[PDB]
Structure 1
C-alpha cells in the first residue's frame, strides 16, 4: 500500500510505496543513499546494487535534486538513520526530472534569493517545520475555542469608511482593508456570548522591521460580561495551551529548527508575570541605566520595540503589561475606576526579545461615555453609529484581544523575521511571488 513518511514507523518490515521528490543523493560505489521527501517528512532510502534491477541502479546513479519519483521497498528499522527508519529500495520509477539547474542547490543562499524562490523554498526542511507548526496552531486555536463553546465569527475584510489600504470598488466608490475585526466581533459577542475572528488583516506600515507585515492573520476573541482581569486569564490560557500543543506534537519540527524546548516549557506552564504600565516603565528605565543600548522610556510615552524587547528578556515566559495611559490608547477602551487617566487594557509580551504577541482591553459599555470619547478623539460619530447601537441596545461589560499568528509562530519557531512564518509574505519591498 502507498504510505506517507509521516506514519512510516507503523509499517515496519512491510512492503510500502512512497511518492515524492529526491532531496539529497550520495552515490558511494555500489550503493546509493537517497533522502526522499514526500511532503510529510524526510526519509532515507538505500538503493543497493543486486537488490534492484540494473536499469534502476543506472538512473539512481545520475538522479538530480527535486526529481519526482515513485519508490517501492521494505521499511527497515535502522538505528543510524534520520528518525530511526529507512526504506530498502526494491524498485524505482522516475516521474519527472528538473528542466534546468534547481535554483536552491547545496550553497548558502541569501534571504532575498530564498524569498524570491519561496514557492520552491517551502519544500525545504526549515520552512517545512515552520508551516507545520503554523498548521498545528491553526487547528489548535479551533479546538481550543470549540471546546470552550466559542463561536468562530468571521469579521469583514472590506470595510466601508475611515494608515489603511484603500480598495477601488465600482463607479469611483472606495472601501478599505480591515486592520482589525474587533468592532464587528463585539457585535458577535453580544449575539453569541463568546466569539473569535480568525482571518487576515492589513496595515499600511512603512516599517521594514522584523515584526511587521502588510498582510497577516489575527485571532480576535471577544466575550460578553467578561472583565479586564478575566481577559488576561483567557489570554494566558490560550497562549500556554498553544505552546504546550506544539511541544507535545511538533517536537520533531522544533528540533529541525534547532529550537530549545526548554525555552518554551515555562510558557506552556502558565503563571505569566503581570506588570502595570507604571511598573513596566520603571523596570525599562532601570534596565536603561544598566545597559546604554537599551533606551529609556519617559512616563507617558508608548513602548517602542526595543523597550518591549529588553522588558521581555527579564522573564522566562510571556509577561502582561496592563493599565496604560488613556491618552495614548484607543477610544473604545474602558477607563480604570480608580484612576481616570488609565484604561483597563493589556499587552502580552513574548520572551527572548520578541515582545507583543497579544493586545487587548475591556470595552466601554456606557453609551454616553463612548459617545463622549468619540468626540474627544475627534472621530465622526456617523461612521460609528452601528457601533453605538451595541451600547444603545443590550449593552454589557465585555472584553477581548487580538493574537498575531505570525508573531506567535515566529516566537515559537525562534525566527529572525515574521515573513518566514507565513507561506507568501507581503512587506513594503516584497510582494512576490
Structure 2
C-alpha cells in the first residue's frame, strides 16, 4: 500500500512505500540524500552507495519513517530499497527544485512541459481546480444545470429550457477559462450581483479547504470576505477618478483606471472587491437591458484592481432588441437567426462570466495571468 508524503507523520516508525519523482539528489558518497516529490509534497530520503538516476526519474522507495529536525518537514525516510521505474535520459533544461528563482520568467515558459512539475509552478493550477469545484457545487445546490454548448445566444436559449444554467468552457489573454452563469425569472441586475457574492464566497471556501497547502506554499494573502461588496455607478466612478485621482477617464474604464478604483475601494471600505454598475449604452452590447437615463442594467466586478467579472440583464422582448439594434446602427435582418427565439415568450433573464485565471492570479498574488494557465499560447 502506497503512502503519500502528506500522511507520513501517521506512519512514524513504520515501513512505507513511496511513489514519486527524483526531485533532487545530493551525493556525498557514503551517504546521499534524495528529495522525492509526489502529488502531496516532497520528503527527504537517506541512503548510500548505489548510483542514482538523474533528477526527475520515476521512483519507488521503500524505507523506514524517522523524525529528524535536520530534514525539511521534520520527517525523513531511511531507504531499504530504491527502485527506478523510469530513468531520466538527460539533465532538465532548468533546475526545477531551484525555481521560481534561478530562471528568468521567460525561460520558465519555454520549458513549461517540465518546469510545471515544480511545487510552486503547479500550485496555482491546483487552486484553480478547487475554485471551479466550488463554483459548480454552489450552483448545483442552487438548482443550476450545467450545459455543454458549441456563445451568448446558446446560454440564453437554454434559459427557456432549464431556467438556470452554467458552463465552464474555453473562450477566445488569447485562450482562457470562462465560468458562465445565466438565470431566468429575475427581477433586475441586482439578483445577479447578489448571486455572485454568494458564489464567490463558496468558491473561496472550497479553495481554503481542499487547497490549503498550495495556498500556504505560495504565501498568498487571503482577500476580505465577498459580502456586501461596495457599488459605484460608472458616473460616480468617473467623478472620483477625476476629482480625487486627477485621472481623466473616457466613456469606458481602462485597465489603468480599474487599478485605481481598486486602490480607492481598498482605502474607503477596506474591500478587495468593487462593483461598477450602470455603464453607458454605447460601451455595452446591443442585447444589454437599457435604462431611461441613458445607462444600462449592467455591472463589472473589480477584484484587486482587475476586472474578473462582467455581466448584466439582457433584453427579452423581441421589439426592444430591434429598437436596440437600430439605435446602435446595426442591420436587424442580419440577426434574424438570433432574434428568432425572442419571438416566443423569453423570460426576464441575465448573466455574467468569471475569468478563472484572472481570479486565480489576483488571488494567489501571481505576477502574470499566464502563471494561472497550464499551457499558454
Q: Determine if the TM-score, normalized by the shorter chain, exceeds 0.5.
A: yes
Aligned to 2:325: 374
Worse-matched range after superposition: 28-37 or 301-310: 28-37
After superposition, residues 15-54 of structure 1 pair within 5 angstroms as 15-28=15-28, 30-47=30-47, 49=48
CA distance in 2, matches of 1:244, 1:31: 45
Counterparts of residues 312-391 of structure 1 (less than 5 Å): 312-314=262-264, 315=266, 316-336=271-291, 339-351=292-304, 353=305, 355-391=306-342
**Counterparts of 1:122 and 1:287, CA distance in 2:** 43
Please state how far the C-alpha of 1:254 moved relative to its aligned partner.
1.8
Give, in angstroms, the shift of residue 6 of structure 1.
4.4
* TM-score under structure 2 length normalisation: 0.90
Indicate yes or no: 2:357 matched with 1:396.
Answer: no
User: Could you report, residue by residue, the CA deviation over 1:42-98 in whole angstroms, capped at 9, with x for unpaired residues?
Assistant: 222222x5xxxxxxx3224xx432122210123335556444543332211123332
The verdict on how the C-alpha distance between 1:188 and 1:79 changes in structure 2, with shifts beyond 3 A counting, is: farther
Residue 297 (str. 1) matches residue 257 (str. 2):
no
- In the aligned structure 2, how far is the partner of 1:10 from the partner of 1:154? 43
Computed over aligned residues only, the root mean square deviation of the Cα atoms, in angstroms, reads 2.1
Structure 2 partner of 1:246: 207
Whole-Å Cα distance in 1 between the matches of residues 28 and 229 of structure 2?
54
Deviation string 1:22-59 (CA, Å, 9 cap, x unpaired) is 11223456433321112332222222x5xxxxxxx322
| TM-score for both structures, normalised by structure 1 | 0.79
| Distance apart, 1:217 and its partner CA | 1.2
SS in 2 for 1:111: coil
* Cα distance per residue 1:209-247 (max 9 Å; x no partner): xxxx21111111000012200110111111222123222
Q: Gaps (5+ residues) in structure 1?
A: 50-56, 157-180, 203-212, 290-294, 427-433
Is residue 2:176 matched to residue 1:216? yes
Seen in structure 2, the aligned counterparts of structure 1 residues 371 and 98 have a Cα distance that, compared at 3 Å, is same
Q: Distance in 1 between matches of 2:179 and 2:366?
A: 20
Contact 2:276/2:299 (<8 A) preserved: yes
Q: Residues 195 and 11 from structure 1, CA distance in 2 versus in 1: closer, same or farther, beyond 3 angstroms? A: farther
1:236-315 mapped onto 2 (5 Å cutoff): 236-261=197-222, 264=223, 266=224, 268-289=225-246, 295-298=247-250, 301-314=251-264, 315=266
Structure 1 window deviating more from structure 2 (230-239 vs 279-288): it is: 279-288
Contact 1:182 1:222 in 2 (8 A): no
Structure 2 residue ranges without an equivalent (≥5) = none
Counterpart pick for 2:125 among 131, 136, 141? 131
Question: For 1:38 and 1:367, how far apart are their aligned partners in 2?
Answer: 57
Distance 1:216 1:11 in 2: 42
Distance 2:200 2:78 in 1: 43
